[PDB]
Design a binder for this molecule. Structure first.
Ligand SMILES: CCCCCCO[C@@H]1O[C@H](CO)[C@H](O)[C@H](N)[C@H]1O[C@@H]1O[C@@H](C)[C@@H](O)[C@@H](O)[C@@H]1O
Ligand SMILES: O=c1ccn([C@@H]2O[C@H](COP(=O)(O)OP(=O)(O)O)[C@@H](O)[C@H]2O)c(=O)[nH]1
Ligand SMILES: [Hg+2]
Ligand SMILES: [Hg+2]
Ligand SMILES: [Hg+2]
Ligand SMILES: [Mn+2]
Length: 266
């Protein structure tokens, strides 16, 4: 909207790709986010000028409330630092949520679950990021991920053929995807986008899962199976590389990953 200020940075090289070892753009022209593909200073300027507020949602039910301290503490060190952040912790144990110190411009809301407004999100944040709680941030996760709708490449299938993707393969399921279809296998542990797009996705998945339940069938990987069906038919405007969803214990640290940003907790 408003003009960017004068900035001094390395000139992009038209005849010199940033990354030659990986695909950095999808066939529908959506950027695939890898380290080396973005200048975070330019992106931070663009999003700060818009006074962008990012909502980060996590569910912590039962024993998972134990993952909240590390999750939040590391989010404070690596997630959208410099921007407005609103954490939404849905839990069945409100009093169990740890007292984590937050930086300025960041807030946390505890929402008790077991039953209990989506209009709230529309008036409080610009983007919604939905992640699993048994994780920790190890490096920068910033505005480079923000876009109308994004999905993240599952670390186990980024180099696999579509036939190997663990999509729901039964035609009787709404999440059905035949062997000759599919772009990528997205992991349900990290997705997001504008509030409107995220709500459209969740409403679509909720309805598809209800239809499956009525037909007596449960998708092989539940919610994730439906997420993949949705993103197949509604292409994400950005795709995050495995840098954003990794497990160093089970997968190590491949040369193709210059940074391990968000990882599973052992
Ligand atoms: C970074 C995490 C990926 C580790 C590889 C196993 O990933 C499993 O993939 C299937 C689809 O084929 C589902 O997405 C599972 N949810 C994934 O497993 C889950 O994550 C691993 C790390 C374990 O914690 C396992 O118990 C989880 O179900
Ligand atoms: O009793 C439970 C099971 C799951 N979860 C949430 O569901 C997410 C996905 O579940 P899990 O970690 O068991 O899945 P995985 O990544 O192991 O496939 C977790 O990150 C939690 O946020 C929860 O809060 N309570
Ligand atoms: Hg969400
Ligand atoms: Hg869906
Ligand atoms: Hg979904
Ligand atoms: Mn998990």
């Amino acid at each position: 909207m408003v003009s960017l200020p004068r900035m001094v940075y390395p000139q992009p090289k038209v005849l010199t790709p940033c990354r030659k070892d990986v695909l950095v753009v999808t066939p529908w022209l959506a950027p695939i986010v890898w380290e080396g593909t973005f200048n975070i200073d330019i992106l931070n300027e663009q999003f700060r000028l818009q006074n962008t507020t990012i909502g980060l949602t996590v569910f912590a039910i039962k024993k998972y409330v134990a993952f909240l301290k590390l999750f939040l503490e590391t989010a404070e060190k690596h997630f959208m630092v410099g921007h407005r952040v609103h954490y939404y912790v849905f839990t069945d144990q409100p009093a169990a949520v740890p007292r984590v110190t937050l930086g300025t411009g960041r807030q946390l809301s505890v929402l008790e679950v077991g039953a209990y407004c989506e209009r709230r999100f529309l008036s409080e944040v610009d983007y919604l990021v939905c992640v699993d709680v048994d994780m920790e941030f190890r490096d920068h996760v910033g505005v480079e991920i923000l876009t109308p709708l994004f999905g993240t490449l599952h670390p186990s299938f980024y180099g696999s053929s579509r036939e190997a993707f663990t999509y729901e393969r039964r035609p009787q399921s709404q999440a059905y995807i035949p062997k000759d279809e599919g772009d990528f296998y997205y992991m349900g542990a990290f997705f997001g986008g504008s509030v409107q797009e995220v709500q459209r996705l969740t409403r679509a998945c909720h309805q598809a899962m209800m239809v499956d339940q009525a037909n007596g069938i449960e998708a092989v990987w539940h919610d994730e199976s439906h997420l993949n069906k949705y993103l197949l038919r509604h292409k994400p405007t950005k795709v995050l590389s495995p840098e954003y969803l990794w497990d160093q214990q089970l997968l190590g640290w491949p040369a193709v990953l210059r940074k391990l940003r968000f990882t599973a907790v052992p």
